[PDB]
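Can you give me the bound-state structure? Components:
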Amino acid sequence: FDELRIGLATADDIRQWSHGEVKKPETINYRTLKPEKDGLFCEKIFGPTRDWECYCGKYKRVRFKGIICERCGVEVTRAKVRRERMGHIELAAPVTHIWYFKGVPSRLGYLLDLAPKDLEKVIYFAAYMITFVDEERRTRDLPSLEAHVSVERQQIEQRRDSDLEARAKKLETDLAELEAEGAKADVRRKVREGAEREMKQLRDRAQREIDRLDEVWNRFKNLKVQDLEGDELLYRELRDRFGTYFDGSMGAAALQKRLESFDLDEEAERLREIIRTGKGQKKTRALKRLKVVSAFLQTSNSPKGMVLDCVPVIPPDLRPMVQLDGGRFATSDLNDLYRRVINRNNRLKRLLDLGAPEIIVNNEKRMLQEAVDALFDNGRRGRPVTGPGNRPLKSLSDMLKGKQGRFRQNLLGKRVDYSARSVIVVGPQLKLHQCGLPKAMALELFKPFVMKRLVDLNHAQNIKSAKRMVERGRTVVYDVLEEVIAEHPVLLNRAPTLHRLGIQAFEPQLVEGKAIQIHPLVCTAFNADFDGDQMAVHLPLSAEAQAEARILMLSSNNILKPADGRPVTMPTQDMVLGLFFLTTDSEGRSPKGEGRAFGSSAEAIMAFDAGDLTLQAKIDIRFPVGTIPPRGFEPPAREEGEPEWQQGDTFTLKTTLGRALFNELLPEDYPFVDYEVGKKQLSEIVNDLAERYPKVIVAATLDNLKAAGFFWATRSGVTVAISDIVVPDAKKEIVKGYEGQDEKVQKQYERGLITKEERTQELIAIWTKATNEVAEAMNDNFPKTNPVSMMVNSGARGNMMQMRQIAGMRGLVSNAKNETIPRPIKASFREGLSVLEYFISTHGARKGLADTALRTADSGYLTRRLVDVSQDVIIREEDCGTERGLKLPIATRDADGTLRKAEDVETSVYARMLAEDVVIDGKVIAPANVDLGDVLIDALVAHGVEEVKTRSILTCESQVGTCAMCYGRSLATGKLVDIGEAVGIIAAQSIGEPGTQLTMRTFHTGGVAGDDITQGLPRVVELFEARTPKGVAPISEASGRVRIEETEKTKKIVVTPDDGSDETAFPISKRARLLVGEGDHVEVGQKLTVGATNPHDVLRILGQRAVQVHLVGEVQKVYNSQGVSIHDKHIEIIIRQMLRRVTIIESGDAELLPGELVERTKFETENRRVVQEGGHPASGRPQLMGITKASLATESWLSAASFQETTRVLTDAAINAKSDSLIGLKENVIIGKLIPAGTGLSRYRNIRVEPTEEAKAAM
DNA sequence: CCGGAGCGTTCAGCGTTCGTTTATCTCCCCCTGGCACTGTCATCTCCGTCAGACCGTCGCA
DNA sequence: TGCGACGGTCTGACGCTCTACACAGTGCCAGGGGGAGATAAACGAACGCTGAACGCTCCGG
Ligand SMILES: [Mg+2]
Ligand SMILES: [Zn+2]
Ligand SMILES: [Zn+2]
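Here's the bound-state model for the whole set.
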């Protein structure tokens, strides 16, 4: 598996694959139910349907396998041969391929200079095509044919003159005889009128035949190859008049004959000549066509695959006709399509056997062509073939395309064995590495292991007896099951699996019931509530799989979230409330025994059990030797005339008993914490523990925190009664005053002194004031003791706006189609809404539900696009030799006389490395190539630095992939990233995970459309897809004088740069709201109008670093407006994948086409190649493209095919005959090999393991 | 004190019975061919995606 | 040729199981060729009958 090739398949290859001809449309016999001979499903062509048997019934045994039966020809072998053995159909008339005709010009190619409508007219038998003309023979005898035509014209004119003379004589004769007879008074006038009517009719006939001769003559005089004529009567006239001069044809045979005489190299030369001298859209034409001609010139694939003579067939087991219970049959649609193809081909053969008219033959040929096209693509042209009358008939290309195709439903995602699924329940008795599997589910997963152990422990005689015991379910089987599942990890997995931690390895443990017991401490890593949530369990099977489960996937090793490096395995519902209650202050709770000395924590616990001491009471408590004092305890000390060190020995501290118990949970080496914990302080404590302590200690400490959090949340006394939710007493008088002034405004409006829009605006303004003020009143009324505030102020669960709309009034609520009702909801959920208030609240609720459904769908789509563009980005080197980096701001927004560090330094500068040392006073502050943390950044900002040159992934120049040092330390593990970690996939998952968490939509348009830019997740998609924004703000090209032009039809802006530069003019709509002065000084940096800048021009006029900063900052301010934090390197990986290409111009010396996508590495290699030859290099402008366009424009066609476009990329690969190296992860998942990342690298699989000499000597 | 008779086992004459084929005689399946007043253009699709892009196409300028 | 715009074309439109189903209006027979099954015979084989015949222990007058 060095690589995988693809190309056009000629008739020879199709015949070589085939084991025979499918000469009959019959599939199976209706009585014997055996496949027919020499047709579809035939055993002679496709192999035996039985095992080692054959059609005629002879040769039943297995011994004489691999022989050809003389009676029927069926080779005796296995039935699975029918999954690999194919045949072919020979066509009576050649037909074209529907992928290449009727497609994109990158796919059709315009190989022959014909329009797509012209190709349609020629191949579907509506117009003849002149494939060959003897041009030199036609031009050599021009005087002879001209003389013949002149002779024909002369004799025609002589006949016309003789006829005119005879007609005149007849007219004179009849006039004379009817004027001599005198039958009527004016019969001579009537006969003269009839005669002249005859004269004009014959003159019309003469002029129409003269025009016919003239038009056929000028049709022959302008006759070239690839010239069509719609009128078959006209072509018949040319054939009957002119012979052996021009060769004509009709249908796909005309294209085949044209491709027989096609001379592609001279056409390529002519297109290159037009490239040298050409303008306009034809230029682009002269570009695109040339590319496809090059695709037929450089590679070895002949264009004989353009039109096909033989049709391959699927092996019959991949288009099965299976028996169904009740005597029915289930048949694939490809059997119907193939049957139609053979039917039409056989009918065409029968028509060609005997004498048939050309119209019937051409009609049957067109039917055969349409049958082949519907076989390859049903529904590409016209109405799709339906069948029973309900749904379109599935074709060959419809299972290589879309969600139902082979690439996405059967290769990337597959069903698995040794897997199960059950609902989850919380088990607090479990450790962090444990999960509770039911008896039946674990017995079914570990069935062969249980059978082997039963055989080994001689409880069963053999495998069959062990299987019978397992199926019966005896108690010794369950004892064996308990013995087996130990030390054998299983992978728990929740279905949405947005990010990396959706699959985690746990040690299984037998539990009762039928539900999986999961640890609470890990649930939010899975985003798993216990409303109802089925989790799947997969079984790592070999030593490698369960080794990776134990080492890489263990749930106790995944404390930190890979998105931003913050801890994720500290859920907050009940444990944080308990720890907060334990560690909170004595505010609002009656402290008994406050301010009394205690000898030890045990005595304080005894006093608490006695009841004369409460948990929250400032007491003077002594601590034994080995207890580390708080970090703030060091500057104070005990007063003594002798030297003392309270860092290692006993000390007294003024604290509550709850803090003493909480620090009993924490390790003895950890410094004492003397503050209210809650949630955020718990986050910094857990982050410090994960940073400074080993994994097992961290797992034990989170287990202790979990256990004591549950324990003290039980005794915290939190509950909900109707007296626990309190409406403010001020709310009644405040809403009374606001209704009084609202009644005053309304009775003022009834006189018409104010418009309704102004009244609505002031009403929503004053009611927003009222709801903010009553929120303030509620936030003043609450005590620190009631459970609802105790669980919203502790970060446990809840938000302040939920308490605002539970205790105080709901506030302004959006109406349908996104405006606000002027009348608010004055009732709290405790008081109960009225009927109409409930209705207008349902207006917003249903919108929210629909919005979050579509938002999570779009987030999944964005995640898929990001993963497919960001793959094949793997740390492949330990370090670069580089010292180039990114200049990031470290301290900003400084006041007078002080310096403040950056607000978002955690996701911008942290977890990176310095490209070079930093010195301010001649001494180094921080070394080079070290991770940045709190203390180092604090030292930098204290010593007085304003910017830091840090080593980023955008500036990485490595020969393969990116290095570990330029990427920086990994955020999932907190250490330096290993060589082989897929950083692109981690980056894509981290970007796409909070897409459903954003929950953003424009509140109100304000009555104007287009004034507001896209916000939320669609803004992120627009940013990553390189699309021009909805509100575009043009950027000035150069510094100069800017002025406005207020033309009535459309506004206009004109800026003239100084230093003789050319003036640039931008058109602006009348609804502009710009911010630049009229006739003022402007430069490149600022924007002329207000809106969202287009990143393409930002790349164009400012540079690649400026547009990198722009994109990173834009996506980070979209994400930061909600509150989600994502590190900058995750964005920068995709941004580097975004700027990887270049658009080339004046490429007359680099010997390739101009104005197309070129990779940076290939362009640079071509630049060295052309400067080593001495020629001047071509020009190249960096091109910023979407993630979809960067995904499709990839070297490997397997990854391109498995992505969105599935038919066009395969045609393009077939024309280009491109073979893909099997590097990358999608085309290694597809083929089944190891991915080239992580444990699948070559540098990890080449180690050899043997024991040491002393270990052998010991035993 | 061998001699004969009865008994055990083992083979050559012709005498019948099997093991496996063969052509002829009913019953059925399956494919090609005949019908002679005249009778010479069907068929319903497809709408309250959807969101914007990519692209060629095309008449106006 | 540049212009918008007109239009067709094309693509996907988070994830799983618990659940999970099936699918409907217009002819008819005669003459002839093959192979499935029943028939009665046939050339060759071996299958039995004929006890005879060789040789042994044998009780023996
Ligand atoms: Mg749930
Ligand atoms: Zn056979
Ligand atoms: Zn590097």
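A couple of observations. The first helix of chain A runs from residue 11 to 17. Residues A 880, 882, 956, 958, 962-963, 965-966 surround zinc ion (ligand 3) (CB under 6 Å).
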